[PDB]
Design a protein around this ligand. Structure first.
Ligand SMILES: O=c1[nH]cnc2cccc(F)c12
Ligand SMILES: O=c1[nH]cnc2cccc(F)c12
Ligand SMILES: [Cl-]
Ligand SMILES: [Mg+2]
Ligand SMILES: [Mg+2]
Ligand SMILES: [Mg+2]
Ligand SMILES: [Mg+2]
Lengths: 194, 195
């Protein structure tokens, strides 16, 4: 029953805009909503990618590779899956492998790619592909990985055992002022719940 | 090594505002960031809660209870953990049981509660507590559960088996043209990856 009637631009930055969304509610009544959108979305099936990078090495427990960065919106450091926006013309998979290498130094192998999933659908239209990638940590290039961070981008790599992920995230939250991402935390919870 | 120098208000609506953040990059170079905030955060731990509701009925598969709603920013229907903003002075646990009952009619028990976790930290300062709740589906109060929607809420309940969650979500996307929430999808992946 529900659908968009109009989208009025309220304020447009270089990267983010605020819109007034007019929609039909299911009783047949017109209602509005304050919506956030990115200015950067062209023909990409999503704004960005998040990478679930499973680091595999013989006689090691599998690790999940995470990154720690300063996030201006948060006024603080956050622990996240490696992630970035999809370049114009770029596939989710190439964006995932490219961002994983830039942020971590690791060269991954694609495992699976989600459909477009919503980041905060009450707030924004922002979507990602969640791309699962395995990293062969026995391969030469994955021996001493060097992040190739872009301009301003400063990332720290944190590799945590998959078999203890939630406890290791809790011990990082206990020991420093830093926020875990909700996708990282949901993934760590499901590893426990399984 | 990095920190906020100043925040400039660009546009303030009723629910959301757009800010320009000035911050010190780790070189000592000053840089700007376009950031989104809610106007509704007060003394709360986080803006909202999301509930992972584990529906436990004997002789049935354990189910994760999800909600489908029209999301105006998405322009489409989304499948999500039940969720809402924490009322001023409401605790995350209490917000979790309230939101779960309003959205699904189920009455549940707190299993665990996350610290505040960020929703989209490149975009916004928005945070939630993820609250794992068990629901005794065999108890009388959860027999014919009464979803109590607030004004302007219109929520469909979708319970999917935990042991098949990711495949069930992929089926819904393929057939129903829904968007799955990133946290729901992340949970569903880890259930598969735990193997
Ligand atoms: O317009 C909104 N935008 C974002 N979040 C909301 C949360 C509650 C009610 C609202 F109208 C809104
Ligand atoms: O200012 C920004 N705000 C949000 N997202 C961004 C993504 C890339 C580069 C940027 F400066 C921004
Ligand atoms: Cl549980
Ligand atoms: Mg990134
Ligand atoms: Mg990047
Ligand atoms: Mg809600
Ligand atoms: Mg509500």
């Amino acid at each position: 029953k529900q659908y968009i009637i109009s989208e009025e631009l309220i304020s447009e930055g270089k990267w983010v805009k605020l819109e007034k969304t007019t929609y039909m509610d299911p009783t047949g009544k017109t209602r509005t909503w304050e919506s956030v959108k990115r200015t950067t979305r062209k023909e990409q099936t999503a704004d960005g990618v998040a990478v679930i990078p499973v680091l595999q090495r013989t006689l090691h427990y599998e690790c999940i590779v995470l990154v720690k960065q300063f996030r201006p919106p948060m006024g603080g450091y956050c622990i996240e899956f490696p992630a970035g926006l999809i370049d114009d013309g770029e596939t989710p998979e190439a964006a995932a492998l490219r961002e994983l290498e830039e942020e971590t130094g690791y060269k991954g192998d694609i495992a699976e790619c989600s459909p477009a999933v919503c980041m905060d659908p009450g707030l924004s239209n922002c979507t990602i592909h969640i791309v699962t990638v395995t990293i062969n940590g026995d391969d030469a290039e994955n021996a001493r990985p060097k992040p190739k961070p872009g301009d301003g981008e400063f990332v720290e790599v944190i590799s945590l055992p998959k078999n203890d992920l939630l406890q290791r995230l809790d011990a990082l939250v206990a020991e420093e002022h830093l926020t875990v991402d909700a996708r990282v935390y949901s993934y760590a919870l499901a590893l426990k719940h399984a």
